[PDB]
Design a protein around this ligand. Sequence first.
Ligand SMILES: O=C(O)c1cccc(Nc2nc(-c3ccccn3)cs2)c1
Length: 331
Amino acid sequence: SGPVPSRARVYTDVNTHRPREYWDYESHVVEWGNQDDYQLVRKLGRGKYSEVFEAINITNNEKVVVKILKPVKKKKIKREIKILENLRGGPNIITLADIVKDPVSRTPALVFEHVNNTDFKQLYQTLTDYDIRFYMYEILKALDYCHSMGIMHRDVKPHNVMIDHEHRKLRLIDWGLAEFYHPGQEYNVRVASRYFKGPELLVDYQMYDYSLDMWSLGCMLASMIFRKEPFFHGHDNYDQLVRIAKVLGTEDLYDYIDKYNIELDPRFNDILGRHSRKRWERFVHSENQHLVSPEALDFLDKLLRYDHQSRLTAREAMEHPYFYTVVKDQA
Ligand SMILES: O=C(O)c1cccc(Nc2nc(-c3ccccn3)cs2)c1
């Protein structure tokens, strides 16, 4: 027999109740603006899928950010655009302002609201205990929103969480890997950065859901409170699961594989070994103890579960004691 099916615990059928055009992005028609409205100022970054620039909208003198896409299948561009338009205006979601056809590359360019970024490699070393709870709460607002809208991000990691620390503002960016959740759909497991891939991706379990983003969030939280980046530091996708298993233990891993009748890649046989579940105290030391508390460890533990069905939802996470003071201040 094959793998046991799975469905999201929450927001399971939200896309089914929408009109088909909400999620049928292959049939999305792109609304193009005027590429002459924008003059590039300077380059801000580059990646495998795009280059990102500061630009000026010369019709109103507004600063914007322009993401010029490298060649990719048009259906992937339609996907990202449709998701950005669906999520526009949601809390802490980057705002897509315009779409233009770049004259040189002949590829699309997405135009986004400007947001000032403090690079995480400089910010994360100055964050207080309170800052981490605050910004984790703000990320959870974006994840609960997009999940409630039927969308999983699938690429949650520090580079995709832009933080203007001076104004305590945060935006979840790069929706190029995001997808619509449909019950029973089997998804590509070649998503997310290595260090943030959930166990379902590493064992090739395709019927995953929003809870994938909650694993990635737990990896971010561990790296911030323990000041260890990345927290699970694998050499490849196989070794990545080994690094997880040396912390979470192999017993719950094999229980997970058994529960969903997952056929484990035979490469894993010789490398996973047998490992006890470790106590989080072993990652606490004098340089990070001010960021670690019983509340943080309880919250972290409830995110980092092999069984995607047993991880906190974004809404459950927001109600955890770790956020009581953040919640009280925001009232
Ligand atoms: O893919 C996306 O959705 C997206 C949306 C907005 C921005 C970026 N990417 C980058 N933005 C910067 C940056 C740095 C300083 C000030 C402003 N932006 C550097 S890399 C990506």
